[PDB]
Scaffold this active site. Structure first.
Site, PDB file in Angstrom:
ATOM      1  N   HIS A   1       0.753  -1.257   0.000  1.00 59.62           N
ATOM      2  CA  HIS A   1       0.000   0.000   0.000  1.00 59.62           C
ATOM      3  C   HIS A   1       0.776   1.295   0.000  1.00 59.62           C
ATOM      4  CE1 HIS A   1      -2.122  -2.956   2.832  1.00 59.62           C
ATOM      5  NE2 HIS A   1      -2.549  -3.207   1.608  1.00 59.62           N
TER       6      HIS A   1
ATOM      7  N   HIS B   1       0.865   4.756   1.757  1.00 60.57           N
ATOM      8  CA  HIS B   1       0.381   5.417   2.947  1.00 60.57           C
ATOM      9  C   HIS B   1       0.406   6.924   2.730  1.00 60.57           C
ATOM     10  CE1 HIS B   1       0.547   1.984   6.058  1.00 60.57           C
ATOM     11  NE2 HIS B   1       0.326   1.503   4.848  1.00 60.57           N
TER      12      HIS B   1
ATOM     13  N   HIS C   1      -3.668   4.531   5.120  1.00 62.15           N
ATOM     14  CA  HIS C   1      -3.560   4.303   3.685  1.00 62.15           C
ATOM     15  C   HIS C   1      -4.012   5.587   3.008  1.00 62.15           C
ATOM     16  CE1 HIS C   1      -4.112  -0.380   3.844  1.00 62.15           C
ATOM     17  NE2 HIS C   1      -3.000   0.037   4.419  1.00 62.15           N
TER      18      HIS C   1
ATOM     19  N   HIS D   1     -11.441   0.499   2.651  1.00 62.89           N
ATOM     20  CA  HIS D   1     -10.345  -0.283   2.078  1.00 62.89           C
ATOM     21  C   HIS D   1     -10.846  -1.415   1.189  1.00 62.89           C
ATOM     22  CE1 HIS D   1      -6.714  -2.908   2.021  1.00 62.89           C
ATOM     23  NE2 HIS D   1      -7.599  -3.869   2.207  1.00 62.89           N
TER      24      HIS D   1
ATOM     25  N   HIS E   1      -9.249   2.488  -1.288  1.00 63.64           N
ATOM     26  CA  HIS E   1      -8.487   3.683  -0.962  1.00 63.64           C
ATOM     27  C   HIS E   1      -7.586   3.844  -2.181  1.00 63.64           C
ATOM     28  CE1 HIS E   1      -8.685   2.339   3.522  1.00 63.64           C
ATOM     29  NE2 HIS E   1      -9.667   3.183   3.263  1.00 63.64           N
TER      30      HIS E   1
ATOM     31  N   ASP F   1      -4.637   1.584  -2.213  1.00 60.46           N
ATOM     32  CA  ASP F   1      -4.841   0.134  -2.246  1.00 60.46           C
ATOM     33  C   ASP F   1      -4.323  -0.552  -3.503  1.00 60.46           C
ATOM     34  OD1 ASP F   1      -6.010   0.077   0.189  1.00 60.46           O
ATOM     35  OD2 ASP F   1      -8.082   0.208  -0.547  1.00 60.46           O
TER      36      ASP F   1
ATOM     37  N   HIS G   1       3.641  -5.165   3.601  1.00 61.66           N
ATOM     38  CA  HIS G   1       3.210  -5.823   4.831  1.00 61.66           C
ATOM     39  C   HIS G   1       3.618  -7.264   5.115  1.00 61.66           C
ATOM     40  CE1 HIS G   1       0.733  -2.532   6.364  1.00 61.66           C
ATOM     41  NE2 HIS G   1       0.448  -2.271   5.102  1.00 61.66           N
TER      42      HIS G   1
ATOM     43  N   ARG H   1       4.199  -3.571   9.229  1.00 63.67           N
ATOM     44  CA  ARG H   1       4.871  -2.993   8.085  1.00 63.67           C
ATOM     45  C   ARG H   1       6.325  -3.477   8.124  1.00 63.67           C
ATOM     46  NH1 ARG H   1       1.987   3.021   8.869  1.00 63.67           N
ATOM     47  NH2 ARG H   1      -0.153   2.226   9.069  1.00 63.67           N
TER      48      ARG H   1
HETATM   49 CU   LIG Z   1      -1.202  -0.928   4.491  1.00 63.15          CU
HETATM   50 ZN   LIG Z   2      -6.440   0.582   2.074  1.00 65.18          ZN
END
Ligand SMILES: [Cu+2]
Ligand SMILES: [Zn+2]
Ligand SMILES: [Cu+2]
Ligand SMILES: [Zn+2]
Lengths: 151, 151
Positions: free
Chosen positions: B44, B46, B61, B69, B78, B81, B118, B141
């Site tokens: 993702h 951020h 995000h 999400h 998002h 995403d 992640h 993360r």
């Molecule tokens: Cu994330």
């Molecule tokens: Zn997201």
């Protein structure tokens, strides 16, 4: 887009966090750098936010107006030319700069570009050799980081 | 910019170089990540390019349009995403995504923001709970970096 931050990291002990804030019509630069040798160290915004090859891949100083290297108070300077930071005997340099050329949005935006602190003093383009007109003979890059959007 | 790049770094073994190129109203994401456990890992963008505390300071995000999400293919997702990247047995994930939502310019450019890979797979807002439609249950993360302008 009014605040930005840059975490400086390298191969050695030099590190630091730099903050940027759009205030009025200018940009205020604050923060500190540690692990430095006492005295002056070139401090510039390089054109690219590319750390794929360490601080090298950041390229030349951010220079959208195609000028020669200079000090922050000169008419002839690169947008990325923020001069020198000064480390005390403990190796700490306190950053406090207000600069008329950089911005955090638009053509002069330094978001997404790299902040670099050099090994040697920036001669402000007055060294007398060709190198002075490009980098101020500031030398290698001790630590760098990509400038990112902050809350 | 039409090109961007991101160097992922974390507290462990995961690291990678991600490339971004604007193409039409899309952004082609490529590159690779190494040191990953086999299987899927949430990938993702951020909100903030703030690394003052590892990947935690990156914030939520990137979600400028205030939606829930989801996965890349969903209308309700998002902007940040990008789904999952897949690591083989050797723990290498080759990234190849074409996204219509992230942009390298304009109001919701991802330049200056943070790319995060992640610990766990992203369930795409279909995990059955509340943590599923905010982070997709991707976990901690592992590596991150600020997206910088590339040459
Ligand atoms: Cu994330
Ligand atoms: Zn997201
Ligand atoms: Cu420099
Ligand atoms: Zn310069």
């Amino acid at each position: 887009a009014t605040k930005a931050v840059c975490v400086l990291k390298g191969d050695g002990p030099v590190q630091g966090t730099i903050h940027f804030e759009a205030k009025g019509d200018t940009v205020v630069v604050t923060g500190s750098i540690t692990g430095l040798t006492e005295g002056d160290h070139g401090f510039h915004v390089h054109q690219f936010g590319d750390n794929t090859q360490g601080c090298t891949s950041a390229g030349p100083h951010f220079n959208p107006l195609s000028k020669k290297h200079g000090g922050p108070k000169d008419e002839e300077r690169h947008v990325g030319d923020l001069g020198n930071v000064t480390a005390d005997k403990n190796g700490v340099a306190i950053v406090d700069i207000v600069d008329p050329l950089i911005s955090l949005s638009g053509e002069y935006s330094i978001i997404g570009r790299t902040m670099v602190v050099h090994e040697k003093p920036d001669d402000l383009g007055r060294g007398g050799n060709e190198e002075s007109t490009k980098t101020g003979n500031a030398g290698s890059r001790l630590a760098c980081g990509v400038i990112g959007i902050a809350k």
